[PDB]
Design a protein around this ligand. Structure first.
Ligand SMILES: N[C@H](Cc1cc(C(=O)O)nn1-c1ccc(F)cc1)C(=O)O
Lengths: 269, 278
């Protein structure tokens, strides 16, 4: 029984409360497709999980013939390596390496730092980084003076302990930017996104697969339109790992037979 | 030891082939040999020396410096990227599966069939099945209704691809009637399809996304455009093919991921792939 870990990140993973009798509400899409829901335990109630990644997990489950239990990441983070001396990963990366999870099914960004300790599938989503703001405030992009040389007058940050945080730490050139960001980062994208609507946050550097969808739904928000950096999401497995080849082979098959497009049509478009 | 046989395949701007200086390989190029046939009635031939440059070649140079290896580059003589013919591979993939090359460097698309017989590195450029039109034509992507049921529109859209590749094979398995209708508009090659769009005989050309983005970016007057990258079908990428269980895959992956993370990848893409248009 595979222990799947994941994280609240719409439109890839929705997390909604359980009905009184321990079950999930049955729902169909507007195009008449059943919205598959799985029980996911998380911070420790059972809850209802569905979305882009859940559909993908179900296909991977049935294609490779395995059962699973899904739980939400304990600390709520994607995962960066931090010092203790010794080092340890937090977030979903920590739970995968520690055995709390056998496989990560989430919008987990593939990068060099994580790829040295875990195995990544071929990407199930091709993607990038962009900036989300409120309608009214307009920014050139990644090179607007309001972010290059920052200030307290214009605030901008990303999600704490995420791939974006890793991206802005490793670069000697983004030092001035990351200085402003580390004192303003958020524990989750939803909190940051909500902060932009509340005007307490002025810009949000985050995953375009999330930000653009958040703009197509919440019309009180828009993004830059640019993609200043491109990255992909992958399935995370331990270094062993008997599932690495077939999970990856199944991601490639799902792209080629239109499955990934139908997922994109259901959740991201 | 760590001296590697590497196969490649000409496809500008990813691999560009030049003759030798008359008069050693020149500047931006690396030596790449090509076994040239004497005629078509014999297997007899001669190793011709040539010079290879381009996007993927720069990748090869960066990998050689980082992963620390030496190599003999050569161009594939039989086939293109790789196609299983009667369960027998040819092209760049063939050189790997049958162990004449330890890795393949080029515009080699990662798919499921090839990943069964070879190992692929992480993708170093995004590609897929995309659509190119003239400015002013409104189409979503491959799965647009004006492509799946062309005769639902009057007049029907005129669109095709270059046959016998991964594009035609993908469309035939996924949309049988689309493939049936679009046979009539099969193009001889990429350049012929461009001219067909420019002169109005074609309404759309379905092909490799990375190739179409490069052509649309270089097009004179910028009249040809591709759909948004969000509507690319069967998204995937060009990757390095290695032998199954190759010991080089891990270090190639981390080096490739390093180039993406430290900007060395974006630099190569403006030195080779970015054009006048947008
Ligand atoms: N680099 C070629 C693939 C390329 C050749 C052609 C063609 O001749 O039809 N179309 N594609 C292509 C098809 C599907 C994708 F997702 C991306 C590219 C290769 O490696 O074979």
């Amino acid at each position: 029984r595979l222990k799947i870990v994941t994280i609240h990140q719409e439109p890839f993973v929705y997390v909604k409360p359980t009905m009184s009798d321990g079950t999930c509400k049955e729902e169909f899409t507007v195009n008449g497709d059943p919205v598959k829901k799985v029980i996911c335990t998380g911070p420790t109630v059972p809850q209802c999980c569905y979305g882009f990644c859940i559909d993908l997990l179900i296909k991977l489950a049935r294609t490779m013939n395995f059962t699973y239990e899904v739980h939400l990441v304990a600390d709520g983070k994607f995962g960066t390596q931090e010092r203790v001396n010794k080092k340890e990963w937090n977030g979903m990366m920590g739970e995968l390496l520690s055995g709390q999870a056998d496989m990560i099914v989430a919008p987990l960004t593939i990068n060099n730092e994580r790829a040295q300790y875990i195995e990544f599938s071929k990407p199930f989503k091709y993607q990038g980084l962009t900036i989300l703001v409120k309608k009214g405030t307009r920014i050139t992009g990644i090179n607007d003076p309001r972010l290059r040389n920052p200030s307290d007058k214009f605030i901008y940050a990303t999600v704490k302990q995420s791939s974006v945080d890793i991206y802005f730490r490793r670069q000697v050139e983004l030092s001035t930017m990351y200085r402003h960001m580390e004192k303003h980062n958020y524990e989750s994208a939803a909190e940051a996104i909500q902060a932009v609507r509340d005007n307490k946050l002025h810009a949000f550097i985050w995953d375009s697969a999330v930000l653009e969808f958040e703009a197509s739904q919440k019309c009180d928000l828009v993004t830059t339109g640019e993609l200043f950096f491109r990255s992909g999401f992958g399935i995370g497995m331990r270094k062993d790992s008997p599932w690495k080849q077939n999970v990856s082979l199944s991601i490639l098959k799902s792209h080629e037979n239109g499955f990934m497009e139908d997922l994109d049509k259901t959740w991201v478009r | 030891d760590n001296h590697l046989s590497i196969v490649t395949l000409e496809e500008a701007p990813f691999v560009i082939v030049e003759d030798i200086d008359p008069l050693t390989c020149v500047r931006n190029t690396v030596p790449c040999r090509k076994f040239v046939k004497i005629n078509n009635s014999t297997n007899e031939g001669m190793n011709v020396k040539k010079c290879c440059k381009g996007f993927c070649i720069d990748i090869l140079k960066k990998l050689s410096r980082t992963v620390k290896f030496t190599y003999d580059l050569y161009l594939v003589t039989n086939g293109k990227h790789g196609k299983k013919v009667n369960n027998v591979w040819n092209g760049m993939i063939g050189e790997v599966v049958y162990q004449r090359a330890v890795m393949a460097v080029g515009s080699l698309t990662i798919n499921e069939e090839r990943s069964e017989v070879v190992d692929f590195s992480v993708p170093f450029v995004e590609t897929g099945i995309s659509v190119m039109v003239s400015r002013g034509t409104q189409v979503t992507g491959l799965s647009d209704k004006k492509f799946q049921r062309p005769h639902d529109y009057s007049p029907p859209f005129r669109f095709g691809t270059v046959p016998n590749g991964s594009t035609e094979r993908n469309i035939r398995n996924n949309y049988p009637y689309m493939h049936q209708y679009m046979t009539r508009f099969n193009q001889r090659g990429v350049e012929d399809a461009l001219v067909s769009l420019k002169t109005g005989k074609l309404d759309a050309f379905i092909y490799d996304a990375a190739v179409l983005n490069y052509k649309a970016g270089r097009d004179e007057g910028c009249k040809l455009v591709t759909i948004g990258s969000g509507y690319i079908f069967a998204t995937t990428g060009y990757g390095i093919a290695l032998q199954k269980g190759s010991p080089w895959k891990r270090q190639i992956d981390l080096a490739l991921l390093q180039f993406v993370g430290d900007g060395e990848m974006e630099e190569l893409e403006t030195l080779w792939l970015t054009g006048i248009c947008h």
